Amino acid sequence: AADAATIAKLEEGFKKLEAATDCKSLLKKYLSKSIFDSLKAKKTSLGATLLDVIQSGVENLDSGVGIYAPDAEAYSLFAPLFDPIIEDYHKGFKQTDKHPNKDFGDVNQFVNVDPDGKFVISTRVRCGRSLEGYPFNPCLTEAQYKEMEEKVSSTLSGLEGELKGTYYPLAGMTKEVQQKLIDDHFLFKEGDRFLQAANACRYWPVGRGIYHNDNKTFLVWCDEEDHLRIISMQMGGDLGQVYRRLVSAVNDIEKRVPFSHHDRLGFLTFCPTNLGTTIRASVHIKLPKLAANREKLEEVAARYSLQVRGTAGGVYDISNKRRMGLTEFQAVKEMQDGILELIKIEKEM
Numbered sequence: 312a313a314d315a316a317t318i319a320k321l322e323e324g325f326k327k328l329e330a331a332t333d334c335k336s337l338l339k340k341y342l343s344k345s346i347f348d349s350l351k352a353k354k355t356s357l358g359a360t361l362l363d364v365i366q367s368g369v370e371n372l373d374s375g376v377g378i379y380a381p382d383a384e385a386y387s388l389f390a391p392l393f394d395p396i397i398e399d400y401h402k403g404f405k406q407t408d409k410h411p412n413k414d415f416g417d418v419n420q421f422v423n424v425d426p427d428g429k430f431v432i433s434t435r436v437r438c439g440r441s442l443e444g445y446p447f448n449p450c451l452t453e454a455q456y457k458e459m460e461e462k463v464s465s466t467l468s469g470l471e472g473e474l475k476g477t478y479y480p481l482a483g484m485t486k487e488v489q490q491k492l493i494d495d496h497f498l499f500k501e502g503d504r505f506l507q508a509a510n511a512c513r514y515w516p517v518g519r520g521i522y523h524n525d526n527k528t529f530l531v532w533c534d535e536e537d538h539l540r541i542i543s544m545q546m547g548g549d550l551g552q553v554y555r556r557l558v559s560a561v562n563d564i565e566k567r568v569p570f571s572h573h574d575r576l577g578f579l580t581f582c583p584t585n586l587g588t589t590i591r592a593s594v595h596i597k598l599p600k601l602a603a604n605r606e607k608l609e610e611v612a613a614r615y616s617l618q619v620r621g622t623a624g625g626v627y628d629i630s631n632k633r634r635m636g637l638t639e640f641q642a643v644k645e646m647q648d649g650i651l652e653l654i655k656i657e658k659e660m
């Protein structure tokens with residue numbers, strides 16, 4: 312039951328989208344007049360409206376996707392918009408498909424993809440989580456940011472063993488502590504115009520924080536883009552160690568804070584293109600000879616749905632694109648298999 316002022320801003324926003332005949336966003340592509348009319352008066356029980364979904368793509372016509380989720384209910388209430396956009400971004404995940412239940416699988420199956428260290432500089436696996444009961448960034452209140460951060464900081468400061476470490480609130484953070492975290496690439500800052508316009512940076516830095524373990528192989532960001540961004544990383548190619556550490560950590564956190572999960576979409580986050588497993592595994596990897604014939608490399612990468620990015624020579628950031636319609640085990644295994652074949656190729660050239 313959106314109020315009249317919301318609906319008036321929505322009608323303005325739809326006409327802005329309609330006027331931008333060259334706009335290429337998925338918002339513009341899929342927000343048809345009939346979907347728009349169907350959804351524009353709806354409101355979630357936490358007060359979120361279609362405006363809290365689409366405003367960033369209305370303000371930033373040059374968005375690629377142009378929608379965000381303001382709370383968990385929004386994915387169901389505004390499914391007629393989210394569903395085709397998710398299908399377009401994750402090809403083959405249809406509006407009638409169902410993301411499988413969580414399955415980290417047999418974690419002992421994951422290996423060091425580069426034992427002698429000659430290829431993989433470093434390995435990272437991250438996931439995202441929303442805490443059950445809280446809205447997402449566009450709708451969190453200042454009080455909720457504060458309360459969530461107390462819950463999360465207490466949870467992280469209780470981690471033991473390899474995961475033991477230090478929580479740093481962004482509120483009140485000194486310049487020297489900022490520099491210390493920057494030097495480890497652990498700091499985050501306010502987001503750009505796409506996130507500002509999604510109302511995702513309100514009350515900054517309240518409720519935002521950074522945790523890492525003593526070994527600097529585990530990093531958590533609290534209320535950056537999602538409630539929790541949980542990262543496991545280390546030098547070398549032991550994706551198996553990285554993954555098992557991530558799984559241990561996620562399970563330990565879940566004991567204290569339950570996560571938002573959706574039967575069709577998997578783990579729910581603020582970004583609709585990071586649902587499902589929410590998992591991004593990546594390596595920084597030196598493939599000089601395969602760089603001398605990138606058409607082969609893009610061919611192999613494509614059949615593992617790997618994104619190959621340059622980040623120095625033949626050094627690549629290679630990560631998995633898939634999130635939907637596969638398990639955590641399948642996603643990481645597709646990554647592992649992809650890197651193992653790329654390395655087998657490189658050595659034989």
Ligand code: NA
Nearest residue numbers: 611613614615
């Ligand atoms: Na393949």
